[PDB]
Design a protein around this ligand. Sequence first.
Ligand SMILES: COc1ccc2c(c1)c(CC(=O)O)c(C)n2C(=O)c1ccc(Cl)cc1
Length: 132
Amino acid sequence: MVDAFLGTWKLVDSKNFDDYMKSLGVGFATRQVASMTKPTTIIEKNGDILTLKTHSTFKNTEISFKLGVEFDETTADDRKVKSIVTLDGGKLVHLQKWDGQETTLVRELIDGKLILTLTHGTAVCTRTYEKE
Ligand SMILES: COc1ccc2c(c1)c(CC(=O)O)c(C)n2C(=O)c1ccc(Cl)cc1
């Protein structure tokens, strides 16, 4: 169920996040800081409204959305995008669109870990979170 995503998660592993951030035009100083951060992700629901918070020493974010209903988003890196989050093959798929560009933030559960795959063009980052 979507319910298995709910709770508090902490970053334990990251692969190619710098490449993903470069692909979005994030500056080197921000990449440095964001590269050494181990955020906490909190996923909550109220009926069919899901809230996803990420907290770190660098930045806090929060979005709320209904699955399958588009929303306007200002991203952590300050892009203004058109977004939708759906459930697809048991994965939470967040698609962001802006200026004819796209990025996906895909979350899936494997062996009790939450795996976040970030794709922007060629750049693919994988980040693993464990349950708190
Ligand atoms: C579209 O995708 C993004 C954007 C920003 C992100 C992340 C993923 C993740 C990935 C995650 O949630 O693990 C973290 C940690 N971000 C930051 O905090 C962040 C904030 C501001 C800037 Cl400028 C750059 C990075």
